[PDB]
Amino acid sequence: DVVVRLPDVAVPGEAVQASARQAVIHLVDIAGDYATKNLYLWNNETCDALSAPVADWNDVSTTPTGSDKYGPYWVIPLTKESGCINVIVRDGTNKLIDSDLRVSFSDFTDRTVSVIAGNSAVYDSRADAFRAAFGVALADAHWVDKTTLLWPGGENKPIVRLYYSHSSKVAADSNGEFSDKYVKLTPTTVSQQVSMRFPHLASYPAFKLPDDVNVDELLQGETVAIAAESDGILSSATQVQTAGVLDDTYAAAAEALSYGAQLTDSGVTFRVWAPTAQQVELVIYSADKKVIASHPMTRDSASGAWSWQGGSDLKGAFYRYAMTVYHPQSRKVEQYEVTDPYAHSLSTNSEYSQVVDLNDSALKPEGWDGLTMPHAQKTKADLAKMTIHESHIRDLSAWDQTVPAELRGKYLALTAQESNMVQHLKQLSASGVTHIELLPVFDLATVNEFSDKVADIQQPFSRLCEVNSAVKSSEFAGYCDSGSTVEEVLTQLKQNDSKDNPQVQALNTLVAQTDSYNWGYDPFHYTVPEGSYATDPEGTARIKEFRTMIQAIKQDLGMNVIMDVVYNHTNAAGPTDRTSVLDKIVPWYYQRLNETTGSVESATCCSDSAPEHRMFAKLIADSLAVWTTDYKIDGFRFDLMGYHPKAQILSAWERIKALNPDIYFFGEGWDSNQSDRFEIASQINLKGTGIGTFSDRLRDAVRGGGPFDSGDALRQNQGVGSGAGVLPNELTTLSDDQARHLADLTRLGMAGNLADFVLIDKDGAVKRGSEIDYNGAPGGYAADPTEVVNYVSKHDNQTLWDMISYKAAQEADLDTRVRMQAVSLATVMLGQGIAFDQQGSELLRSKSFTRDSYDSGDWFNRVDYSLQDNNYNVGMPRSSDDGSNYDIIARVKDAVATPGETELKQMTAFYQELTALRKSSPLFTLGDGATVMKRVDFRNTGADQQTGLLVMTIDDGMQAGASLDSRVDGIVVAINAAPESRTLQDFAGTSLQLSAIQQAAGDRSLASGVQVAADGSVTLPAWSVAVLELPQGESQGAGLPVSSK
Ligand SMILES: [Mg+2]
Ligand SMILES: [Mg+2]
Ligand SMILES: [Mg+2]
Ligand SMILES: [Mg+2]
Ligand SMILES: [Mg+2]
Ligand SMILES: [Mg+2]
Ligand SMILES: [Mg+2]
Ligand SMILES: [Mg+2]
Ligand SMILES: [Mg+2]
Ligand SMILES: [Mg+2]
Ligand SMILES: [Mg+2]
Ligand SMILES: [Mg+2]
């Protein structure tokens, strides 16, 4: 075999070295035209060392100072020799490096650097750039099955090889020869199996390893793909992504096993999947975290799993896995201890995993095993009744002075039957809220569970300074030795807070670093409860407390429980970070990587996971199985579900239905951009599967605008619920046509956002739901309404009240704005889709305009169950994300008074009326899409409609089929989202009756002032909601037949 070696050419010296007040940049012409090469140079805040850089982007005259055969270079004048400079390397006005370069004079003290076109790295010399160009670079080779490598670098090259080194890096030796062992590769054609697994790589050149290759040998260390010419000079070399071959080699054998510290009465078996590790030891720790044993584990050859079996005396023991494993990011054989990705119990702050048997009676509240789901979820009609209250453990109880102090912010607050919060939830349940959805209660990373390291706003400012050095070094340091609590300081800061002095958020942003508050979309361990919500985060105690909460919700409050789950990302990856678990144990397998660099992708926010890989799909299903069986969770909401393959979500659902036949799955099925890799679990792709998705259609039509809005657009973009068209504010330009389009989306959503539902649009045209456009997408997408989750408020983005406050006309008074809140919620609560709402919408909840409140603390997330106010106007929201909105906030904020007890009680009554109406007839919750189509229609449609009046009919008459409600032959839902009184004339001669529920509320009803006249006409006041019924006589009547279209 020919030996592969570096180019036998001289390594380039420097063309020139920077002198005083100069920088030098070489463009190293690695590719075997210099006059058109030029630099764009500019000073900004962070880099400002350039002397008089040319201002005009179009000026291409900063051409090379000199050049030679190794390329051109530039000498650049500076005003100082410290700091950095901004550089874009161009040909003409086109970038030759896609990255905007930053040349650091601290990383390159001689200020003489080198770059290569198409390469974002900055080198200290042309020699370094040259050796990098002919060395291991990037990671664009993919070893996808036993014998197949996909690699663009190997195309049309005679020598293509897979070099490998068990304990070091593949590199050229002192002679310049690559002397590590290798396997010869040959051109081949990709198999269909591989093409279906990796469609985004299917067009890459394919190469074949010998059928007798010892894969386990190569996978234990570094592998590098190397291409060369016939003479044997290296052409390119790159690192190898191995997840595909790991699945092809090990996944079936590994899928057949179970993982974690599996404790039963006979003993314990520990198992961890680590098919590339060179060694795995099980380290057992005492309660005081001293090592008491380190056990070499036993590797199984078929699966690449490691196991160790011991006695039941290991119950309660702490443990970690000591890994010896090559990590391709660092290119080192790393040595570190890692917690179990299958941990079911943890020490404080997740430092050690703990052996537990979740079946143990000591970890269960009394009567746990007999806990039943209070609301059915079997049929589609059952599911359609789902009415969700999306809640957070701290948002519930952090402020409730009637919850015992030691339970504030804890799972166990739900057991405080004497508290305002629990009594309020109990009344919401009695009125028709059916499900609590919990924000992250698995083990999150972003709260410190060591209570000594945390300071909350109810505690002395002196404590804050002790735990938070940023506060102690800030402009607020003078409060350190005050006798005030943090919340007392924040309160005194309100009066002088404004857009010109956002001092409340200035202090609160520092507080956020060390408080107990986070939404928790930051997974540390997927299958252990979060510790900070327990009264004792050390060891197994949180398990029973979590179960006590679940039992309280289901048995005592009468609501089902949904968990938010976050399998689309990990909190961290790589070999170093505290919270990198999976990516330490099987590096490069559990994360989705860029096809060229091997970098962990971050489209989700964080460290994107790879649910398309078999062992991560298994981890997800196994995790859901524990939450289902051991924690009696009734449904799951998948965060960023579009990052998951449709096939993976469906397989998980099949697996969980074997454990709980009525489990319900839904998620955020927004487009994830992953369709090139697999069919994504999106709104459209899930049609007909029974997996629900949040609908953005009715949401945005009723709220107005969308999550990206900033500045004046927040006010201009009124929604149906805030008077689009009919009650314009001073900035909007919405036309009547635009407002009527939003009403088309709203009606479609009230009918379950079905693709095939037939309506009359704003122009009088007959349209299917899929033909009503939503921001350039088919609006209706579902097969059944139980596939659609409607909402107008959620933890993310502004609260409904804050949206109404941005959008409402100046003349809309406070009482009108409360009715706008209720009218907005009526479109959800009286619609056929599953109903979902944010905790506190019934209390006009505000976040003081905060759009994204995940780390905005108790202050901005406060819900006041004592009913004094709605948390509006408590300071400008965080400047980093809402500073662009300070101008519009200042202009709208004080239009009307802040809600107090009167408005909060009024809104709670409106809310409970809506949820009671939703459950008052099976007709609101038909479940089956074909049944919706046969029974649901709309009036007041087309070009002659009265804008803002939504009139929905639901048929129970003979033309619909059977009577599903023995009391009525039909229902009319009329939502008059407008400042005028409206009269309905199309039910003349039929004698409708107002719902008994609305009658019983009298002048506190949303239908207060509705008139049903002798001629059958119905008059609705401004901003009202009426549910009217056709009473059923001795036999089923004519009803309200759907009109043929
Ligand atoms: Mg310029
Ligand atoms: Mg240098
Ligand atoms: Mg080929
Ligand atoms: Mg007990
Ligand atoms: Mg935690
Ligand atoms: Mg103020
Ligand atoms: Mg925080
Ligand atoms: Mg405590
Ligand atoms: Mg991609
Ligand atoms: Mg589109
Ligand atoms: Mg409140
Ligand atoms: Mg009937």
d(Cα 849, Cα 497) in Å, to the nearest integer? 14
Buried b (16+ CB within 10 A) or exposed e, 923-952: bbbbbbbebbbbbbbbbbbeeebebbbbbb
Rounded Cα–Cα distance for residues 508 and 516 (Å): 13
E strands present in 278-434: 279-285, 291-296, 298-299, 305-310, 318-327, 332-338, 353-354, 387-391
Residue type (1 letter), 875: G
Ligand 11 midpoint to CA 839 (Å)? 10
Residues 6+ positions from 304 with CB-CB distance below 8 Å: 246, 249, 250, 253, 254, 273, 274, 275, 276
Q: What share of the chain is helix, strand, coil (3-state, %, to 5)?
A: 30, 25, 50
Ligand nearest the Cα of residue 207 is 3
Of 647, 573, 652, nearest in space to 620 by CA: 652
Gap from CA of 520 to ligand 10 centroid (Å): 31
CB atoms within 10 A of CB 778: 16
Q: Minimum-distance ligand to the CA of 535?
A: 8
Ligand 10 being an ion, which residues bring their Cβ within 5 A of it?
776-777
Give residue 476's identity as a one-letter amino acid code: F
**What is the rounded end-to-end Cα distance, in angstroms, of the chain?**
77
Spell out the residues 6+ positions from residue 798 whose beta carbon is closer than 8 angstroms to its own: 806, 847, 849, 850, 851
Give the CA distances from residue 397 to residues 220, 403, 900, in Å, rounded to whole numbers and listed in that order: 50, 7, 20
Ligand nearest to the CA of 361: 4
Decide: 177 and 4 in contact? Cβ < 8 Å: yes
| Ligand 5 centroid to residue 528 C-alpha, Å | 9
Using the mean position of ligand 12's atoms as its centre, give its distance from the Cα of residue 316 in Å. Answer: 59
Nearest residue to 613 (alpha-carbon basis) of 250, 325, 262: 250
Instruction: Considering every ligand atom shown, identify the ligand nearest to the alpha carbon of residue 450 and give its number.
Output: 8
Q: Ligand 9 mean position to 27 CA, how many Å? A: 30
Helix (H/G/I), strand (E/B), else coil: 112: strand
937 is catalytic: no
For this structure, is 668 an active site residue? yes
What the block records as the tokens of 575 is 């070999």
Q: 368 CA to middle of ligand 4, Å?
A: 8
In single-letter form, the type of residue at position 211 comes to D
Structural domains of the chain, with CATH? 1-127 (2.60.40.1110), 128-237 (2.60.40.1130), 238-356 (2.60.40.10), 357-936 (3.20.20.80), 937-1045 (2.60.40.1180)
Q: 987 alpha carbon to ligand 12 midpoint, in Å?
A: 18
Q: Which of 668, 802, 913, 955 is catalytic?
A: 668
Active-site option among 639, 696, 787, 969: 639
Is 233 in contact with 7 (CB distance < 8 Å)? yes
Could you give the angle at which helices 901-919 and 814-829 cross, rounded to 10 degrees?
20
3-state secondary structure of 231: coil
Distance CA(261)–CA(319), nearest Å, equals 9
672-675 contact pairs (CB < 8 A, 24+): 672/603, 672/640, 672/642, 672/643, 673/603, 674/642, 674/643
Tell me, rounded to whole angstroms, the distance of Cα 837 from its chain centroid: 17
Radius of gyration of the chain from its Cα atoms, rounded to whole angstroms = 32
- Report whether 742 contacts 925 (CB < 8 A): no
Chain position carrying tokens 């059958």: 1016
Ligand nearest to the CA of 448: 5
Q: How many CB atoms lie within 10 A of CB 577?
A: 15
CA separation for the pair 960, 822 (Å, rounded): 30
Nearest to 771 by CA among 750, 744, 746, 743: 744
Gap from CA of 817 to ligand 6 centroid (Å): 22
